From Swiss-Prot, chain B:
SUPFAM superfamilies: PLP-dependent transferases. Keywords: Amino-acid biosynthesis, Cytoplasm, Methionine biosynthesis, Pyridoxal phosphate, Transferase. It is found in: Cytoplasm. Homotetramer. It comes from Helicobacter pylori (strain ATCC 700392 / 26695) (Campylobacter pylori). Its EC number is 2.5.1.48. Catalyzes the formation of L-cystathionine from O-succinyl-L-homoserine (OSHS) and L-cysteine, via a gamma-replacement reaction. In the absence of thiol, catalyzes gamma-elimination to form 2-oxobutanoate, succinate and ammonia. This is Cystathionine gamma-synthase.
UniProtKB/Swiss-Prot annotation, chain C:
Catalyzes the formation of L-cystathionine from O-succinyl-L-homoserine (OSHS) and L-cysteine, via a gamma-replacement reaction. In the absence of thiol, catalyzes gamma-elimination to form 2-oxobutanoate, succinate and ammonia. GO terms for cellular component: cytoplasm. InterPro entries: Cys/Met-Metab_PyrdxlP-dep_enz, Cys_met_metab_PP, PyrdxlP-dep_Trfase, PyrdxlP-dep_Trfase_major, PyrdxlP-dep_Trfase_small. This is Cystathionine gamma-synthase. Transmembrane segments: none annotated. It catalyses: O-succinyl-L-homoserine + L-cysteine = L,L-cystathionine + succinate + H(+). The gene is metB.
From Swiss-Prot, chain D:
One of its GO terms (cellular component) is cytoplasm. GO terms for biological process: cysteine biosynthetic process via cystathionine; methionine biosynthetic process; transsulfuration. It catalyses: O-succinyl-L-homoserine + L-cysteine = L,L-cystathionine + succinate + H(+). Homotetramer. Its EC number is 2.5.1.48. This is Cystathionine gamma-synthase. The modification N6-(pyridoxal phosphate)lysine is found at residue 192.
Amino acid sequence: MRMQTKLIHGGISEDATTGAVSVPIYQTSTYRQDAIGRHKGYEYSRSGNPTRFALEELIADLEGGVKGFAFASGLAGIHAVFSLLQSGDHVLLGDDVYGGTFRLFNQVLVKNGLSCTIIDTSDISQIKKAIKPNTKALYLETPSNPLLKITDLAQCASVAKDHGLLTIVDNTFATPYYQNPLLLGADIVAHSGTKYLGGHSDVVAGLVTTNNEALAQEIAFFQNAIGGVLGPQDSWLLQRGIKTLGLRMEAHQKNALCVAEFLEKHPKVERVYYPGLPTHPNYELAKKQMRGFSGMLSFTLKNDSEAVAFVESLKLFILGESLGGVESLVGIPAFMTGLVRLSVGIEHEQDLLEDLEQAFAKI
Amino acid sequence: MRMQTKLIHGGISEDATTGAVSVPIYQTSTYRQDAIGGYEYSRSGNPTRFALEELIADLEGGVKGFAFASGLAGIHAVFSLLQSGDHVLLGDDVYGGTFRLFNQVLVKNGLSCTIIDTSDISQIKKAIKPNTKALYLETPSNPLLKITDLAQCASVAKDHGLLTIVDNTFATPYYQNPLLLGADIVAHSGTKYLGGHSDVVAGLVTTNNEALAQEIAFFQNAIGGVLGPQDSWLLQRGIKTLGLRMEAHQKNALCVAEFLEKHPKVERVYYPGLPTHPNYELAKKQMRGFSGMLSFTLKNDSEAVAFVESLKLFILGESLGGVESLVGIPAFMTHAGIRDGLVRLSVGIEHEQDLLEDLEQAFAKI
Amino acid sequence: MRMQTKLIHGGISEDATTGAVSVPIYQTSTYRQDGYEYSRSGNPTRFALEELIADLEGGVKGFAFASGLAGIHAVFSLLQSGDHVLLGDDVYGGTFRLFNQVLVKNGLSCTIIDTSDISQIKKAIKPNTKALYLETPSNPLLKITDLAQCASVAKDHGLLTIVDNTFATPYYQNPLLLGADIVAHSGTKYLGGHSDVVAGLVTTNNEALAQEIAFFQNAIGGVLGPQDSWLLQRGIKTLGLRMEAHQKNALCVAEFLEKHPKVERVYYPGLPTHPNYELAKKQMRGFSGMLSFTLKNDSEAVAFVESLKLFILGESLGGVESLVGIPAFMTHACIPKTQREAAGIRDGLVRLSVGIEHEQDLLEDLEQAFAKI
Amino acid sequence: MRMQTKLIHGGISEDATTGAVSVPIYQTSTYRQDAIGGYEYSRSGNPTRFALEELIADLEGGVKGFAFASGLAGIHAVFSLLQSGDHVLLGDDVYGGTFRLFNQVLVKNGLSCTIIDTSDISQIKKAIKPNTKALYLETPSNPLLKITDLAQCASVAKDHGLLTIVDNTFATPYYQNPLLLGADIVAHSGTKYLGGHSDVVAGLVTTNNEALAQEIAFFQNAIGGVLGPQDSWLLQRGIKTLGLRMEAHQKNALCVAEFLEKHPKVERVYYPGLPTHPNYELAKKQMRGFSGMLSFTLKNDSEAVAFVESLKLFILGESLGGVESLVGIPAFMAGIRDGLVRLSVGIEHEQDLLEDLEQAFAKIG
């Protein structure tokens, strides 16, 4: 079965006992057991839950892993991933990773004996040079946010492997529909389900999956030990949202192209950051490792002062703080995470252009 | 507003714009701004979650409330307040998962702990180091229901540089308020009595202190182990009957304890409400009642499994604090005074007679 | 075999084919082929010494250089541009000069820190720090640095602990056994011992580091000749006895100096009153012949040194002959005066390399010099 | 919402319950509670004061605003964050009372300062000590209108562990917004351009930073140098015409600068709006306009007092930033010659202002 068919029938997508084409929401905390040391499969909802498990199975099935793990948020998942390491360990970050991941290290992890080194990861040599005797992981994120900066996954993975290093990839922007880091040498993949996977701006969730059984034992342990689990209703809604991913990602791509092209041939606009443009640095690398480009695009205007007047005069893009939803979103990462980030939604392309038009006419 | 009225109308229990007597569920990740510069992003804040947070703050007399994906998610973020190189003092019978947090997650993140009997006040004195930054209390204890003087402990804690953190899961806010007794931070598993219907996994933390509130607020948002709006809403709904439930829990538990103690095959009963309990007077002092938690040791240890496996009403299972009665053997589940034969009962709200008849029939099988 | 026996029979101390109890001097640049090829890559006289120093400091490999500086240069040639290094504030002027004048122009960076204060090193670590250079006891204030502590902290960041072990020789202190990754020596000093050889020695715990050092010894070409290799090895054979005598003499001299009305402060790790005496005792099996002392009147330091007739007014140290210098007017003349006082180096500070002469002759020379001020 | 609009509807410009287009004046000291557990005590919080604080936060791009009894009391509270044994860099011509605050109040409390020319970015680099915590800028500067590059000094301070503190009184939030140029704390003397009507003594402070906001709040409350409700309200009221007043101030000030410059009897003229002014290109870049503040030194230095005492429209008085024209010799009230005349150009008719100057010049040699 193909990706499109897997989004609908993958993992667990059916109640085995009733035939329900939808996995039931197990709003429960505990489970009755036959004799002690002989359970019915589930013991306690923090450790495992049939609804959450179905979702965890789905994301594993999609990214080509052995196990999935659903979390209360993207950050909670990432946090649990880094709980695999001791104090005295080192991690190499990309120079433009998501701000909350930076704050995770800066303010939570570093504090606990975990050191990081920020480097440009599209500069393969900057990673070669940055490894210390205690470096235990390489944390990549491509396309990056904002700026959509592409990193070479297979290369970095190869390089991380001949050193005793973990390749941990944040696949949020380019979904499992467009990119599968585990098939390119990654050990652990993390998403914000809060974004595209959910895709209706109505769930806060993180998903992690892995290629490695030993890694999976570890991640499980810390999901259970720290307990930042995804609830069953959210799990169910995430899975429901995931069902449409393919169609949504297609529509996201189609729209964001029209938007990028229109923006590039504009008098008010200077540079434009989108992976689908032949004009974007490493465009070739992208077509190599991505089956498509999402709906994210940063960009800048020649007049750097108007940035805030432009964003605030738009009437169809929602001025808000997330991305990856069916509604188009807009931000300015200066005060949020003269650069303007667009999360192109799945509204009619013309209405999106007409909305950008009228907001340009105003500056 | 008294406790029993507060449970229903406390924190935010109403929708202000619409008038709705229930808080609406905000299944939403992000909010439109008229910005740039109330709500911005659901991990940082959410109206459903907030209403519950205000509720629990209101019930414990804290300045802020914090809702987590699980009890443990809450405790974890509480200990994220500390730097590597810091020292923590622990109870010798703290909940199994709390001990595992330190042993498996927090020690390897550079924190050190020391296990002392918290009912022994001089043991806490003797165990204090220069890097000791906090004392962690759980009373009554899981699973032996051991009682610890909260005023005394917080007193000794306060006149060193120490934080007094209390897990108040067993007594809930209906029967004990550690903040009003000198504690700095209070943590619950909302999965237990607060939800009460064994259908939600949830943590709740609250604090006396405005600055401490900012720190927890920081690590709630930064680590991101937040309760979802649906679970927040359901947990709030559960809390509305907390008062009535705890009374039934206490009435039944009292009845059961007095049955088990008078029973031929039983050796000791651990229940704070039994006059013969170590620190029974101290319980009456710091608690407005005892919950539904008790455990007992049966004269012949080898019969504990067979006893537990032949109960027909009590559900053999992992958790506690629900309307349905639960039973476990701590030795083989959640995990000094703990013998393989120890049996822990979570007395639910069924008919006292239905619960007694169940135990009667199970003893007849050993 | 124990350290004292190891100075005589360790590394390679014997010619296997001929039986000679002294390794032959291979004054050759090349070798016929049908395990040596070129003397800049490998030479059996140098190799013998190399094995010895590795064997004494408990290393996997040794590397003999044309000079102490040459070795320290080879070590720091490991790091790429962008890398940052932590240096002790009492670092050898030439080591400080290497960074200031050679390595910086190549893309390195440093920060100067008092290494006797462990929190200072913590405050100074950057994400791009790769190394920590330690030197204990220090010149000229003989200030002690907790080797194990500093090695450990450095290890739990991504750092290589590099220790200059010249002053307290492998006979009294073994950094690699206390968490150091690389040990460097100026063989010019106590190791050779007869002020007649200029040489560097470098050894390491780590096979991978050893391949790195080996490569740079060879590619940069600052190697030690076979004659000097042999001379250095000969000197090392009496390292034990000489150190015993250095220390005996030094203790005696230090004790004399603090009995002394004109002398203010004496800096010697073997004195109980020395800051970190207890730490000294933990990581050192003894103290060297190195000491300084400040006298109450600064301007009297010139006259004191000038009237000395046994101590030789000289620049070096660690030989069998006693040496005297005034760090402010010799080893540190370039540095602005008010900065020298900032770093504890008064114009009245006098450094002695206490040699192995009869202690009484050494003391009678000090008495007559005092008697003349 | 644009700045011109924001001055009228920003922060809180309306009573929520009643719909009043003006914020009501809460002459109250205390509030009934249904406690134990919004407003508790007027020193901690007052709805009127808060309205003004929200407005300034909103104007400067801050997260919180803070209203004080005076510009000084605010500056005080800002520096109250620092421990003893800390170090601070000061502009060589910061406000006379800002120096007297450090010189005589904060120093004896264990604080240390170094006077530097901040328009010399290399000079600040030369003065950083290991114990230095903050740089304090003031541009344009009193009374020479010396301009400092906010963006660079912020950067230089940002890559060290330093706090950028800016006194934005002169070029108001309408012309300059330091917080967007990498500043951490902005402070105003509300007594000046913000009130605009020379009838309120006030100080306003705002910040980019949550943790700094917690701190400033703490010290505003603990020292208690808070602004009253009536003064807050009058201040907010004043702020509503800020945009209109600043435009007229500039239009007049440029008109005067060009009169004084082309004048035979005048020597130098200080005004950021003059092309021939140190760092004029810098002014244009970080400021959206030049204000009503200008100074000038005349050729006959001893006849400075005679000039000032013969002005009929301009008022010889002790302040600035009002709708009426003010004049003072900053020396009587390092650049400052005992014949430097400082002009606070009001919003009166320029012809009337110029005709007051003509007649004053026509009485000196």
